[PDB]
Design a protein around this ligand. Structure first.
Ligand code: HEM
Ligand SMILES: C[C@]12CC[C@H]3[C@@H](CCC4=CC(=O)CC[C@@]43C)[C@@H]1CC[C@@H]2O
Ligand code: NA
Length: 398
């Protein structure tokens, strides 16, 4: 009848806790029907790692199909069809070659000197201010912003402008479809004007390459190119901003974790990997994939036409994959998490986010051995109504 399929998300999120329903689903109903907050009909929620790798990793699932306004989705506005996430291979592959060179592990690693220099600079400004201080204001926000503005070639003077835009674009329930469609439109025209400036004066930056491509690639559309600029500018700071605060929260609320990194700072890369695994940065669900053919998952054959949604954080707690999966452990031998997704849409910024997180924690644990949270855990201002989780403020002392 009117379905008794449960609403997803199941609940408003609490700090970085996973809803307890996911462990129940993994063990007893790993693929299950749900109703998403927008779109029509139902979708399969996938909570286990092997199923997640098939949904994310197989041509028989299409994200392009999900651009239909009737397809279930986690966000109010229908997906933009020229957005990178809504492309299927091989069209997706051609689109990613627009920018991909700049994001290889090799080119990102070459940014470490520049990136460390910027971190130290912001922590200089924090030490000037004096303890206590808001870590979000002095580190979590300015640091990513500066990295992505250098790489893209966005002016740092526009931070306030494009952070308003990005916050709205990451709305889950916080903003309505209309408000988000207006911001979408404004961000588009803004990005298009940044790229259009390179047309009489090319720059050695990503926006530079974007502008060369609008002239010399008769297989890429200006809509796709400009949307790539917009996507990179959003994901390129909003993820790491949140993840810096999230990692710091995990470290300070069981100080032993932080103390182990203070004692041994070369453990930081591994810790970053383990906290990526453990942190439900993506608040709930994922970009929907629609089966274009019947596909076998662990417990169910998804029919052609049926949508699916992966919960990344749930797959990252799969007990068949990780030992003591509900525990945070910086000395795991194996960590095949999907905090950065999997398959064709594997995060393009994965190496850059790793670099940023490593340089931010490494600097903290070496310079601020005495760092602690200097506001009550009860009052922490968790962002509400967004597709990702993180803190609006994090006052710390040292
Ligand atoms: C640690 C921080 C980050 C996390 C946890 C993260 C997580 C993810 C995840 C899970 C996906 C897959 C979404 C899906 O397939 O449904 C993804 C895709 C993506 N991420 Fe990231 N990301 C991070 C940092 C970044 C950065 C720094 C950038 C840009 C420089 C970026 C840009 C993207 C883009 C463009 C995609 C879409 C890729 C595609 O469709 O081909 N992300 N990210
Ligand atoms: C930025 C972006 C929208 C927000 C996405 C981001 C990929 C990673 C991610 C995971 C989600 O499930 C939604 C929020 C985010 C953070 C997307 C890449 C392109 C798209 O425009
Ligand atoms: Na979607």
């Amino acid at each position: 009848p009117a379905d008794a399929v449960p609403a997803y998300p199941f609940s408003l999120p609490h700090a970085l806790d996973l809803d307890p329903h996911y462990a129940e689903l993994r063990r007893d109903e790993p693929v299950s029907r749900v109703r998403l907050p927008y779109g029509e009909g139902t979708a399969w929620l996938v909570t286990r790692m092997s199923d997640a790798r098939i949904v994310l990793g197989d041509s028989r699932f299409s994200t392009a199909a999900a651009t239909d306004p009737a397809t279930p989705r986690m966000f109010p506005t229908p997906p933009e069809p020229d957005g990178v996430l809504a492309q299927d291979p091989p069209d997706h592959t051609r689109l990613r070659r627009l920018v991909g060179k700049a994001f290889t592990a090799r080119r990102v690693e070459e940014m470490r000197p520049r990136v460390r220099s910027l971190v130290d600079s912001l922590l200089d400004d924090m030490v000037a201010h004096g303890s206590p201080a808001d870590l979000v204001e002095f580190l979590a926000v300015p640091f990513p912003v500066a990295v992505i503005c250098e790489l893209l070639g966005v002016p740092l003077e526009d931070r306030d402008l494009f952070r308003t835009f990005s916050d709205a674009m990451l709305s889950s329930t916080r903003l309505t479809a209309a408000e988000i469609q207006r911001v979408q439109q404004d961000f588009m025209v803004y990005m298009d004007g940044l790229v259009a400036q390179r047309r009489d004066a090319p720059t050695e930056d990503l926006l530079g390459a974007l502008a060369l491509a609008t002239d010399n690639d008769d297989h890429l559309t200006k809509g796709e190119i400009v949307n790539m600029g917009v996507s990179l500018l959003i994901a390129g700071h909003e993820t790491s901003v949140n993840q810096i605060t999230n990692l710091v929260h995990l470290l300070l609320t069981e100080r032993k974790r932080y103390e182990s990194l203070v004692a041994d700072p070369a453990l930081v890369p591994a810790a970053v990997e383990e906290m990526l695994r453990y942190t439900p940065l993506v608040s709930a669900g994922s970009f929907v994939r629609v089966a274009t053919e019947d596909v076998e998952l662990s417990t169910v054959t998804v029919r052609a036409g049926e949508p699916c949604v992966v919960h990344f954080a749930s797959a990252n707690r799969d007990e068949e994959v990780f030992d003591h999966a509900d525990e945070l452990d910086f000395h795991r031998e194996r960590n095949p998490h999907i905090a950065f997704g999997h398959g064709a849409h594997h995060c393009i910024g994965a190496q850059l986010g790793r670099l940023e997180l490593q340089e931010a924690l490494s600097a903290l644990v070496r310079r601020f051995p005495t760092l602690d949270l200097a506001e009550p855990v009860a009052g922490l201002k968790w962002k509400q109504g967004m597709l990702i989780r993180g803190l609006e403020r994090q006052i710390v002392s040292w």
